[PDB]
Amino acid sequence: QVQLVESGPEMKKPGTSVKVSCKASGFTFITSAVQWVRQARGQRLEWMGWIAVGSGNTNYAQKFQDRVTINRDMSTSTAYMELSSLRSEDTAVYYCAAPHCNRTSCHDGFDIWGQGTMVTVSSASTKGPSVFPLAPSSKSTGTAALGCLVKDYFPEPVTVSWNSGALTSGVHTFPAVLQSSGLYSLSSVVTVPSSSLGTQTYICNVNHKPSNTKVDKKVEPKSC
Amino acid sequence: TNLCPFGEVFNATRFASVYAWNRKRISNCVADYSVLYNSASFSTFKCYGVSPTKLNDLCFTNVYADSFVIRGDEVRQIAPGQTGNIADYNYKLPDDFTGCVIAWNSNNLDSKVGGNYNYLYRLFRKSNLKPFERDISTEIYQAGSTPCNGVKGFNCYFPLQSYGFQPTYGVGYQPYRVVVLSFELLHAPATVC
Amino acid sequence: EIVLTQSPGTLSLSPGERATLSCRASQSVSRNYLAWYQQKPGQVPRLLIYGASSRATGIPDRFRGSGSGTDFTLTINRLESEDFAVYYCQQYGSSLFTFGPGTKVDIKRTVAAPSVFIFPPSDEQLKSGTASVVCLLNNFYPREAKVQWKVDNALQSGNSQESVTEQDSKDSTYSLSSTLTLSKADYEKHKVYACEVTHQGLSSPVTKSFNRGEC
Ligand SMILES: *[C@@H]1O[C@H](CO[C@@H]2O[C@@H](C)[C@@H](O)[C@@H](O)[C@@H]2O)[C@@H](O[C@@H]2O[C@H](CO)[C@@H](O[C@@H]3O[C@H](CO[C@H]4O[C@H](CO)[C@@H](O)[C@H](O)[C@@H]4O)[C@@H](O)[C@H](O[C@H]4O[C@H](CO)[C@@H](O)[C@H](O)[C@@H]4O)[C@@H]3O)[C@H](O)[C@H]2NC(C)=O)[C@H](O)[C@H]1NC(C)=O
Ligand SMILES: *[C@@H]1O[C@H](CO[C@@H]2O[C@@H](C)[C@@H](O)[C@@H](O)[C@@H]2O)[C@@H](O[C@@H]2O[C@H](CO)[C@@H](O)[C@H](O[C@@H]3O[C@H](CO[C@H]4O[C@H](CO)[C@@H](O)[C@H](O)[C@@H]4O)[C@@H](O)[C@H](O)[C@@H]3O)[C@H]2NC(C)=O)[C@H](O)[C@H]1NC(C)=O
């Protein structure tokens, strides 16, 4: 059972520090090396640094030389990464990787990876979303589009269903975006035939567990 | 009729690193072991093959005095049949060891405020050392399949590492000076009584 | 720092074809230390190829690596359905390690133009002092698309953000959501709001517009 287990989710205010754990199991920790890679939501892998377990020697990328310090504690067989002076741009998922080794030899690559640690940095407090309807256009002849606007909420995530699960086909819920105000905004839409606009009702089910918010909103065709 | 120079060993102003452990040969001298066991300034004192008290009434052909410095947690490795980074890659005692292991805390001497990086230990080595073997090669250790030919990089690190003794470490990380006395009995005229 | 680049950005292939990914290093690798990783959405990277041309444990034989100095290749002989994900390369032989930008391998599909819709801000939101205009691009292929907001016939930049869904498991299409966000004061200062959509499946940019106050 060659394993590598990391810390739980972290949520630190901007300007503070976060220390992510990364404990090893199944192999001899003393002789391998641990690297740290972060990945923003939907972005590429970004290499931060690495540490040799035996010597403790570290190497850090240019971007992270100012605020990142990688250490290890071979008594607990755990390596740590500390990121000071946190900010909204640091909000990402942090991974640790290491080669599986025995007392004398190592794998030629990082084949052991951790499960990931979600670090969220934001000044804004918890907030329930305002749900606004996206009414279908009157310029629709065969298929029209309608949806809801889940705007200004924190933190992630929110769940959205239509007609409480009866409507699933042609539904698209987009991943949220972080506004400059620190709050998230999301939009979920659905394409239905233009004929059914007058004889079928469409209600979006927005549920936000961190705030215990259950907002349902009816989307009605534009009326003058 | 002259006593053995046990003072030059136990009282040396500087001790060697465990990977390059010092060894002094003692012969043709009257060994007075009385004060050594009486000495309360020694933290560790374990003899294997001979009794600590019943020792002054013994003659040996050669007596070897080995001295070095290790961590407090690593003193338990200076014994026959032990395993660890020190017993496997630095200083190894045979299974049929005939001698005594002596150690004492030296945090007041071998530790500096900024860290004393003079004491080193061999961290990586391909195979375990033979008994009383000594390895001082600084050849870069190749951990992965691909070599390096002298490249301090991933899966290719320097085989030697420093202790960095500071006075604020715990007793396990503090420096301990060790003196290992081997009692050799050959088919030659005896010289140490 | 050694710069790492991959090509293409998105590789559109059908299940069964042979995929060929490229990874380029700004200078010669320190020690032929090039690793290939596979990442499905919302998952942890998985090592496929380590050290130029050496398959990791548990990887099927259809994955292969090659290269030597600055140009390296990841080749999948017969593309299986479980292989459609993003692929990253990483050099890790010279002190500092670096990653590539990634290469997304998606299922091939015929060109499909997007269904474009525009949504004025609800009266409930205008009560909040904020206005949000939404531009929907529904079910298109490939993912490459461009959205340009225009307020009173003027190209708008800033106060705009996009979002793309994953490749749908039925029609293999993507969908984009662009949101323009202004204050109620700024919104009430104009009449025509439109988003201009440019796509490969459109012979000319398609524009959907509305007039404020004229429902
Ligand atoms: C510690 O790990 C060492 C490295 O092993 C690999 O790396 C680690 C990280 C793991 O992933 C591990 O699973 C990997 O295997 C490991 O060293 C390895 O030890 C084995 C067993 O002693 C060696 O295999 C034996 O090799 C001989 C002859 O090898 C010659 O050829 C190779 C090139 O092909 C040369 O590199 C060698 O120098 C030799 O010249 C084989 O004859 C032998 O058996 C074969 O035949 C029998 C039937 O008789 C079959 O059952 C076997 O499957 C074989 O086909 C072994 O294969 C291996 O060479 C060696 N590798 C290295 C790089 O040193 C070590 O054992 C581990 N120690 C501990 C305590 O865990
Ligand atoms: C390692 O060296 C130490 C220290 O060496 C001495 O101390 C340092 C600070 C320097 O001054 C150096 O020049 C010295 O040589 C040894 O520790 C001392 O060793 C001596 C001799 O082995 C021993 O006598 C000390 O014990 C003390 O003894 C006095 C008096 O005891 C005898 O001496 C006087 C004459 O000087 C006689 O009149 C008396 O009757 C006794 O015969 C006691 O008063 C005192 O309480 C203490 O017991 C040792 N002192 C200490 C602190 O350890 C050590 O033996 C050396 N070890 C080895 C293996 O060589």
Numbering used by the authors:
A (entry chain H): 1 to 141, 144 to 226
B (entry chain E): 333 to 525
C (entry chain L): 1 to 215
Publication excerpt:
Alpha-B.1.1.7, Beta-B.1.351, Gamma-P.1, and Delta-B.1.617.2 variants of SARS-CoV-2 express multiple mutations in the spike protein (S). The RBD mutations found in Alpha (N501Y), Beta (K417N, E484K, and N501Y), Gamma (K417T, E484K, and N501Y), and Delta (L452R and T478K) are located in or closely adjacent to the ACE2-interacting surface where they have the potential to modulate ACE2 interaction or disrupt the binding of neutralizing mAbs. To understand this, we generated 674 mAbs from Beta-infected individuals and performed a detailed structure-function analysis of the 27 most potent mAbs: one binding the spike N-terminal domain (NTD), the rest the receptor-binding domain (RBD). A detailed structure-function analysis comprising 22 X-ray and cryo-EM structures is presented for 16 Fabs most in complexes with RBD or S, which allows an understanding of the changes in antigenicity of the Beta S protein.
Beta-47 is cross-reactive against all variants and interacts strongly with the back of the left shoulder-neck interface (contact areas are 582 and 234 Å2 for the HC and LC, respectively). H3 makes the largest contact, in part to the back of the loop bearing 484, whereas LC contacts are to the far edge of the left shoulder, in the vicinity of, but not contacting, residue 478. Beta-47 is also glycosylated, at residue Asn-102 of H3, as for Beta-22 the sugar lies in the vicinity of the left shoulder but makes little specific contact with the RBD. Beta-47 is very similar to mAb 253 previously identified (Dejnirattisai et al., 2021a), sharing the same variable genes, glycosylation, and a disulphide in the H3.
